[PDB]
Every structure is written in C-alpha cells, then in structure tokens.
Amino acid sequence: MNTVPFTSAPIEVTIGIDQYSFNVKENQPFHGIKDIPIGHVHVIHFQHADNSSMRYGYWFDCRMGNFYIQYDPKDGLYKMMEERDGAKFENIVHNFKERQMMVSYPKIDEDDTWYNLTEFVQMDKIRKIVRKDENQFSYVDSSMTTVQENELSDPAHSLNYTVINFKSREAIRPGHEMEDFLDKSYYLNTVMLQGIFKNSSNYFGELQFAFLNAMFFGNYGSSLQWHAMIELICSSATVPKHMLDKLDEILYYQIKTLPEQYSDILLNERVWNICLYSSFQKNSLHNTEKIMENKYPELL
Amino acid sequence: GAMNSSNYAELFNNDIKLFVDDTNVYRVTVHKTFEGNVATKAINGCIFTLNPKTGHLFLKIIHTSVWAGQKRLSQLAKWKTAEEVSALVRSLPKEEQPKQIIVTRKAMLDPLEVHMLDFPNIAIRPTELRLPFSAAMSIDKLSDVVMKATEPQMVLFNIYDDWLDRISSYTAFSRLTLLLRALKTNEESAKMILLSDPTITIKSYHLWPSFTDEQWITIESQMRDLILTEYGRKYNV
Ligand SMILES: CN(CCO)Cc1cc(N)ccc1Cl
Ligand SMILES: CN(CCO)Cc1cc(N)ccc1Cl
C-alpha cells in the first residue's frame, strides 16, 4: 500500500482519488491519502469550492516515485511533486499516519471497478499522450485540447491522442473508397492496430484513458477520442474475437461507473445507437447493450 | 455550406463549379416473375454533371453491366457516381477543375468527399434547392444516347445550346430549370409546348428548338402556365 502526503489544505476543495472523492474545508487538517493500491495507475483530482471551473488532476503510479501534493498560492492550485529524499518521505508519511491526518483509499474488497477501468492503462503511455517528461506524473484538466482539436492552440499543453479520422487518406485506401468507408477493418486492423498501436492492449489503454479524462475532468476532446475509438471497432466487420469480448467488458464498466446525471453530455447518442443497433458489431456487445438499455434507455 | 435561395448568384460567378445529380444513375423497371414474384431489371443510366455558368453537361452513361453481380445497388450507385466524378475531375487540366462540386442530394456528400480526398481544396456542398435535373432523361437526345449505349461512355452536350450568345448564364439557367421543371411535372404537355410548331426545328447539334427571343418568352410563359396548372390539377385549386 502507498501514500500521497499533502503539505496542507489551504483552500476548500473537493479531492478525488480514482472514483472516490471527499470534501476538504479551508485549512482543515488534511494531510493526504494512504492505503493506495499498488499495481495500478491512479488519478488524484481537484475541484475548488470557489471555482468549479477547471477540474484538474494528476495521473501517477506510486511505483515510479514518492509523490506528494502541495498547494501553490501563486499559481493557485494543488500541485503534485516528487520527493527524491526517500528517508524524508517515509518519515513525513509515518508522522502523519501516527497523527491519523490521512484518509484511507476506501476500496471495498469485492470491488474490481478501478482495475476494470484501468486494465490496459499504463503510465508510460499516459506520459506520451501528456507530454511533460521532467515529471513522472501527468497533469490533465478540463480545458486541455487534443492534437486533433488543434488541427481543426498551445502544443505543449495538449492531449496527444492518436488521431482517428474516418474521412482521411489514412482511413481510405485508393480504389477501396466505398469498401473502406463502410467496413473500417483495414483502418482498425492494419493502420491502427498493426501500424500505430502495435497491439490491442495499447489501443484499449488509450480508449480507457480517454474515457477517464472525459469523466473526471469533463474533457471534451477526450470524450471525442473515446467515442471515435469505439466507433472504429464497431464499424469494422472483421475484429478479433478476443477484442470484441474485451471491448464489451471495458464499455460495461465505463457505462456502469458513469454518473447518471452526466449521461446527457458524455454519451454521444449517434455513436451509441450506431454501435449497438446498426454496426457490424451490433450483436457482439451483450453486456454493454444490456446495461445501456437498462440505465440510459432514453439515449436510445 | 449549403447552396440555397440566398446564395443563388454564386452559381454564375467565375469560380468553376459543377452540379452533380445522381438521380438517373441507377434505373430499373419493376416486373412480375413467372412465379408471380417481383424482380427488377436495370436499364442504362447517367450521371448528370453540369457547369451552370457555361452549360457544359458531362453526361456519364452508366451501362447496366456495371451492376452485374453487385449487391445493394442504390448504395453502390452513389459510390459509382462519386468514382466517376472524381475520375472526371482528375481527367481535367488543373485550371479546368472545379473549385466546388454541388450535389443535388445529401446522400452523395460522403461518397463524393471520400472519393475527393486527394482534392482537399475542392468544396463538396449540398443544396436546399429542389432542382429538376432528374428530368434530364425527358430531353429526347439525352435519353436516346443513354438507351443506345452498349458500353460505358462519356458524352458532352451544351445544355444551353447557343443561348449564351444572347442571354446571361443566370437567365440561361433559369430557362433550363423552368423547362426541366415543366418536363418533370407533365412531360407530354411540356413536350407538346416545345414542338407543336413544326417550323421551329432543333438543330442537329442542339437539344432544344431554335426559338427567337420572342418565341422563348412565349414558350417560357406556356411552361409557367403548365406548372401552375398541374399544381391545381394536383391540389384541386
Ligand atoms: C508537511 N510536509 C512536511 C513538512 O514538515 C511537507 C512535505 C515535504 C516533503 N518533502 C514531502 C511531503 C510533504 Cl507533505
Ligand atoms: C462543345 N465542346 C465539346 C466539343 O467536343 C465544349 C464542352 C466541353 C465539355 N467538357 C462539356 C460540354 C461541352 Cl459542350
């Protein structure tokens, strides 16, 4: 189990850790989060009480360093930092645990939700989407735009997701215009899987990461990316059977976890209806279709 | 964006553009089989690609052989149209290629955009106008070349004959749309109007009769009466 120490909590903030969250009052004696499960990426995120504009947060993996949060009163946000002095970190953490100033990562034993949402997500790939290589953790917020959004403006602060565009020369082989546009298998299997992602795990990892940035930060370009990666699979007549089964599990847990009250903004009616009811894979996502129909039948 | 009432005059400026109409590409007769089921028989079609400024009609004849062994022919027909239009643009010198292609039906947008990916600078546009280009097969000489074709074939007609020697392209296009609208509403009556006077002939190299200015005004008036008429006969007014 690992720990993220918080210097202090000078401003009132709602703090999220993965799918959990709690309210910290201005100058309440909050000094961090303990018992964080090793073996997964995690995200610690923030919404100030005074300005619900800008949710923001940090993707991290506790195996890659000792990390802590400290409010910066000049830049006005809770910043993640790395402490390199490991003795000084264990010491601080131990003092705050002894004084019981930390909340415990509240995972129920039966519960594999976070695993299921992050199964293919790897800190190395996150750091390539979010470029800032002097840190081992990655900052994301509500307002960051994607490389593709910037093609349609600060490149350093962008989400470098894999560009997917169904009406592009990359997607469409000369002489197979109709075939490749109506059945995207070439684009999925040869261009994207064999060419760019190398395997389906890296593909699913980016898909899962885009969903999570969409959900936790309301990052609109991440939502676009998540839906595009779903649609590319659903619009392909030829998909490995193992990918279809895994996709159904991935989407199931995403739909399960989504706040009911956010379904109106984070779920694209056209893509979901197409994917569940018109696409080649309309019959291949049994779990996802069942949960969608029972939880958001309005959308369909 | 879309072409409509408000930006009608753009059609007659000096930026090359083409209208593409796919409504006569896939054509069938529907008939009963010996068993009493229904089947279709394809007949020759055409793509109607028109430069509204000059009257250039690039008439691509679609021979029934292109459908042989194919499924989902109404969807294929849109992609075949897009394939032939793209081929036409590629065949043209750069300085004759259109800057915009306006499709008369929205279902052509994606097929044509995909086929024209190589031409990112050609704008593919829909239109809110209900243009009567489906009636092009009521022009006798166009129908005749389509039905006689035994292979795929491109034919070139000025659909305005020599009208631009005397009138503007705006006026020429209005006349054409009026004639086609009339032929679409009541072909027999429209054709009666155009041909009732044996002394006014169609030149071998023309599609329409050689009316004087004064006779065209009369023709045009008769075509508007017809269209208004049929509209009563249809709606009981
Ligand atoms: C509150 N702590 C202890 C200060 O005495 C500040 C801090 C400094 C480092 N270096 C690491 C974590 C924290 Cl949380
Ligand atoms: C009349 N000429 C053709 C002669 O072969 C000009 C023309 C060129 C294209 N491309 C279409 C229609 C016409 Cl009418």
Q: Which fold name corresponds to the CATH topology of the domain at 116-299 in chain A?
A: Serine Threonine Protein Phosphatase 5, Tetratricopeptide repeat
C-alpha end-to-end distance of chain B? 36 Å
Shape designation of chain B: globular
β-strand amount of chain A: 15-25%
What is the class of the largest domain in chain B in the CATH system? Alpha Beta
The H-level CATH homologous superfamily of the domain at 116-299 in chain A, spelled out, is Aar2, C-terminal domain-like
By DSSP, the count of extended strands of chain A is 10
What is the share of helical residues of chain B? 25-40%
CATH architecture of the largest domain in chain B: 2-Layer Sandwich
Oligomeric state of shown chains: heterodimer
Helix/strand order of chain B? EEEEEHEHEHEHHH
Q: What composes the largest sheet of chain B?
A: 6 strands, mixed
Calculate Rg of chain B over CA atoms: 19 Å
- The helix tally of chain B amounts to 6
Characterization of the model:
The complex is a heterodimer of chains A (300) and B (237). By secondary structure, chain A is an alpha+beta fold. Chain A has a domain of 184 residues: Aar2, C-terminal domain-like (Serine Threonine Protein Phosphatase 5, Tetratricopeptide repeat), CATH 1.25.40.550. Helices cover 41% and strands 16% of the residues of chain A. Chain A is built from twelve helices and ten strands. In chain A, the strands form three sheets. Chain A has a five-stranded antiparallel sheet, covered by helices on one side. In chain A, strands 1-4-9 form a three-stranded mixed sheet, covered by helices on one side. In chain A, helix 7 packs antiparallel against helix 8. With 237 residues, chain B is an alpha/beta fold. Chain B has two domains: 155 residues, Prp8 RNase H domain, palm region (Nucleotidyltransferase, domain 5); 74 residues, Acyl-CoA Binding Protein, CATH 1.20.80.40. Chain B contains six helices and eight strands. A six-stranded mixed sheet of chain B has the order 7-6-1-4-5-8, with helices on both faces. In chain B, strands 2-3 form a two-stranded antiparallel sheet. In chain B, helix 4 packs parallel to helix 6. The radius of gyration of chain B is 19 Å and the shape is globular. The two termini of chain B are 36 Å apart. At the A-B interface, helix 5 of A face helix 1 and helix 2 of B. The site of one 2-{[(5-amino-2-chlorophenyl)methyl](methyl)amino}ethan-1-ol (WDC) has 7 residues of chain A, from helix 1. The site of one 2-{[(5-amino-2-chlorophenyl)methyl](methyl)amino}ethan-1-ol has 4 residues of chain B, from strand 5 and strand 8. Chain A: Component of the U5 snRNP complex that is required for spliceosome assembly and for pre-mRNA splicing. Involved in splicing pre-mRNA of the A1 cistron and other genes that are important for cell growth. Chain A: It comes from Saccharomyces cerevisiae (strain ATCC 204508 / S288c). Chain A: One of its GO terms (cellular component) is U5 snRNP.
